[PDB]
Amino acid sequence: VGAXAXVXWXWXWXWX
Amino acid sequence: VGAXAXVXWXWXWXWX
Numbered sequence: 001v002g003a004x005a006x007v008x009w010x011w012x013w014x015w016x
Numbered sequence: 017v018g019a020x021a022x023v024x025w026x027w028x029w030x031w032x
Contacts, residue, residue: 003017006024016030 001019002021004020004022005018006020006022008022008024009027010024010029011026012028012030013026014028014030014032016032
């Protein structure tokens with residue numbers, strides 16, 4: 001339960 | 017301050 005809403009931003013990297 | 021560690025799984029989408 002660290003904090004924020006997920007670990008990072010979005011899901012993946014850049015855009016596939 | 018939701019929860020976790022950031023806001024998603026990485027940053028962006030897929031992989032670039």
